[PDB]
Design a binder for this molecule. Structure first.
Ligand SMILES: CCCCCCCCOCCOCCOCCOCCO
Ligand SMILES: CCCCCCCCOCCOCCOCCOCCO
Ligand SMILES: CCCCCCCCOCCOCCOCCOCCO
Ligand SMILES: CCCCCCCCOCCOCCOCCOCCO
Ligand SMILES: CCCCCCCCOCCOCCOCCOCCO
Ligand SMILES: CCCCCCCCOCCOCCOCCOCCO
Ligand SMILES: CCCCCCCCOCCOCCOCCOCCO
Ligand SMILES: CCCCCCCCOCCOCCOCCOCCO
Ligand SMILES: CCCCCCCCOCCOCCOCCOCCO
Lengths: 289, 289, 289
């Protein structure tokens, strides 16, 4: 069986003083199509493959192509994946929950470099022999993630730096906990990064959370992000504040809101301020199909 | 929801004396696939996105890719679109009704340069930040079209020439009228073009029409095209004659026929002669799927 | 109507002493998606078009694109195809039946160069104006194939070498016979190649066969491949031995097995040795969707 799913999003993206002779406000949009082939068996083992076709405004050649494939095998709560995999630091829960606006961005997200699923082709040729293996398991309300990424599988392994990561999250109805660690993140020797987060569902309506990072070799240093959200009917309000160790950085912050216009249709906007005082704002829609 | 539709066409395309050491007759073919994602809401607002994958014989690299996306929102007869939009001069009725043959061509089509939906990627990099906005409305048997195209939305607007167009068409059972105007067509300063057309359905079987253009800065100058068609059962016969102001140009003309072999299957051919005496002929099929 | 089908395969591919500073064992995988549009008519003539999107590990840019299209028309057992066609030497039965392992390879396959359906784009620009025509017919348990491939249809024909091929196969329940011949194979003047094969189904379970080739201008010279397979429940065992005329070449051979894990899911592996003593091995899965 082959299924197709995806989403479109478009709206206004504003970046204060974007650049000499550049407009500060543009129309930023994205079309994402996922192509999934699955083979179910009577033995309970499911095999699958996926491809993504993603277009973003500004893309080179005004064209869209597929990325590199991902393959998986699932059996009894265990999933093994190969090729262009989802990585542990990028898949744990809570680490991206301060994101807001129609482009789901936040200066409070980790400031480090690490491998993650590649949505598009890479013209530099850097990903041509990139191959990963990942294993996930949901044991109880516990989720475990493991990933191994080799940036160039064809070359003798002693010449390349491979990325290894682990993560786990756990949740009941009101508290959630998550942690991750990855060594040689992004294939950079000694760029070891870690995450610990927790969130409290202080209502069916509200949530407050705190994420802490060790950003490895990034110039940002350690980081802490405190964020929260509250739902009022169809509208959700969100906010966050984040600090990094880099000398002289400002405190980043943002405030935004989502409006659930209909099932699959979300209108969002946000106003944020970064670590270097950058001012960014957005407003737009996302529709799922 | 995601739907796929398209067509294939193949046949013979002949160009008298195409070129030194070139064959005059080749097999010209096209495969077009449209990918449409839509999200319907109970509020009556529909959101959609579309992507096209088009291959034509002769294309570079013997490969096919997607173009740049188009997004829209429809509500009560009004449609707003963003990104790679359909433009007003390219969408009005009547302006392409002299086209004939399996590749739907005509020297009687307007000889000017103007933006229109881009079916494919552009290797020159000229379309990378091209973004348009369009609005259509069917008020009665009236159709109104408006389009705004910015060839490079990232650059300060005083440095770029934007294209603005309007058009309207109207029809009852026997007369149709259409007009369009576009300023700085194709992003070329002072290339302002206009169209006025009318057609008379002198039967359930026949139609005669006349289109007039102002081709802006093109060397063709003003143009007039008189065309007609008549249906005899499953076969339709078509003809046209067109004249442009360019000094020394010949009168262009063409005669062709369509045969409706079955629903979705059309066999067509034509013999045409251009403004510079070029002789072109074709015969082939198109099937819709 | 538009349908999508395909397969994914992944596993380990081992090549003894692949190269200085290279790993001998890598994870080799492929994702293939076929896009087929068809228009059926009440007259019994079916029209179709197809596109392929294929990704293999190692591909340039870590991306996937469509290839060049293929068009066909079928009526009463006769199929005419145009564009990126299937060729006669590549479509006859028996010629690839010694292939084994999850990547279906065999040194016993013909060692010659000839045109065949192109699964992907070609960055060299060599296929940009490549166009073929093919005709197939199943008259009784007989299959006939004819193909004509012009490597550059736009250029005067006396300047290009076109490939012409024919083939036929025939089968009852226990014997199969096949033959093919192609002149100027692969567009190489005087590279004329031929195939004759026969197979004996000495059981419902076993088969032994013999293929003979004339490899035209290849340095391999004439070749003979003797192969066999035997099914034991869900597992199939296969073997082959092949010899070529090239002076000093070794005898190639291989042994492998397939395991039908479920409908659409096949686990395969093989160990093979080539004409230059290369040692290659594989183990992996293929799933159809
Ligand atoms: C095989 C899938 C198609 C992907 C091929 C695209 C190849 C394009 O690059 C060729 C070399 O030129 C360099 C491109 O410039 C950067 C492109 O990507 C960035 C998106 O904005
Ligand atoms: C060129 C300027 C236009 C670009 C700016 C887009 C800015 C739009 O977003 C502002 C809205 O952000 C949300 C504010 O937080 C309050 C939410 O609650 C109020 C209404 O539900
Ligand atoms: C058709 C008239 C010319 C249009 C003026 C050009 C001005 C450019 O755009 C300004 C902003 O308006 C359009 C954008 O569509 C995205 C809006 O936000 C999404 C819904 O929440
Ligand atoms: C990202 C979508 C894939 C589109 C990328 C194609 C990029 C190819 O160009 C790279 C630079 O080389 C120039 C190409 O020659 C012209 C191609 O287009 C014309 C069609 O016949
Ligand atoms: C190399 C020469 C072959 C290429 C030429 C293709 C020419 C085929 O088209 C000629 C047919 O055009 C239609 C003529 O107008 C008369 C229509 O009514 C008659 C039958 O229904
Ligand atoms: C298989 C024998 C070799 C074929 C001869 C090569 C000659 C090249 O083509 C000549 C014209 O015929 C084929 C084209 O298919 C398109 C025909 O028109 C479409 C249906 O109305
Ligand atoms: C139009 C469809 C997209 C296909 C375009 C890809 C164009 C890429 O090449 C541009 C020129 O650079 C040369 C590429 O290197 C070889 C690529 O193919 C081999 C697969 O491993
Ligand atoms: C780095 C080494 C790993 C790569 C080698 C893969 C080798 C795996 O394939 C060996 C199996 O080949 C099949 C053998 O023939 C006997 C079949 O019958 C026995 C079980 O059903
Ligand atoms: C997650 C721990 C790190 C993984 C070790 C890296 C070693 C690389 O791979 C070794 C072989 O195992 C994995 C391959 O998946 C394909 C196996 O064969 C397919 C099923 O028949």
């Amino acid at each position: 069986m082959i299924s197709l799913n995806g989403y479109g999003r478009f709206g206004l993206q504003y970046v204060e003083d974007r650049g000499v002779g550049l407009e500060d406000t543009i129309i930023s949009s994205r079309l994402r199509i996922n192509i999934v082939g699955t083979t179910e068996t009577d033995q309970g083992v499911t095999f699958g493959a996926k491809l993504r076709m993603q277009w973003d405004d500004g893309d080179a050649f005004a064209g869209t192509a597929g990325n590199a494939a991902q393959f998986w095998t699932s059996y009894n709560g265990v999933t093994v994946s190969v090729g262009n995999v989802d990585t542990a630091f990028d898949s744990v829960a809570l680490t991206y929950d301060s994101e807001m606006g129609y482009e789901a961005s936040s200066f409070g997200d980790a400031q480090s470099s690490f491998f993650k699923y590649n949505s598009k082709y890479d013209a530099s040729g850097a990903l041509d022999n990139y191959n990963g293996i990942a294993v996930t398991y949901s044991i109880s309300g516990v989720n475990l993630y493991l990933s191994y990424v080799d940036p160039d599988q064809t070359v003798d392994s002693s010449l390349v730096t491979e990325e290894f990561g682990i993560a786990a999250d756990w949740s009941n109805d009101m508290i959630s906990l998550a942690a991750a660690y990855t060594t040689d993140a992004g294939g950079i020797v000694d760029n070891d990064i870690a995450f610990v987060g927790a969130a409290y569902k202080f209502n069916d309506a509200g949530t407050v959370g705190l994420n802490w990072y060790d950003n490895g070799l990034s110039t940002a240093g350690d980081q802490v992000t405190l964020y929260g959200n509250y739902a009022f009917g169809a509208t959700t309000v969100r906010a966050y504040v984040s600090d990094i160790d880099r000398a002289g950085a400002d405190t980043a912050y943002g405030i935004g809101a989502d409006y659930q216009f209909a099932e699959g249709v979300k209108v969002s906007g946000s106003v944020q301020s970064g670590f270097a005082n950058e001012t960014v704002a957005d407003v737009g829609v996302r529709f799922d199909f």
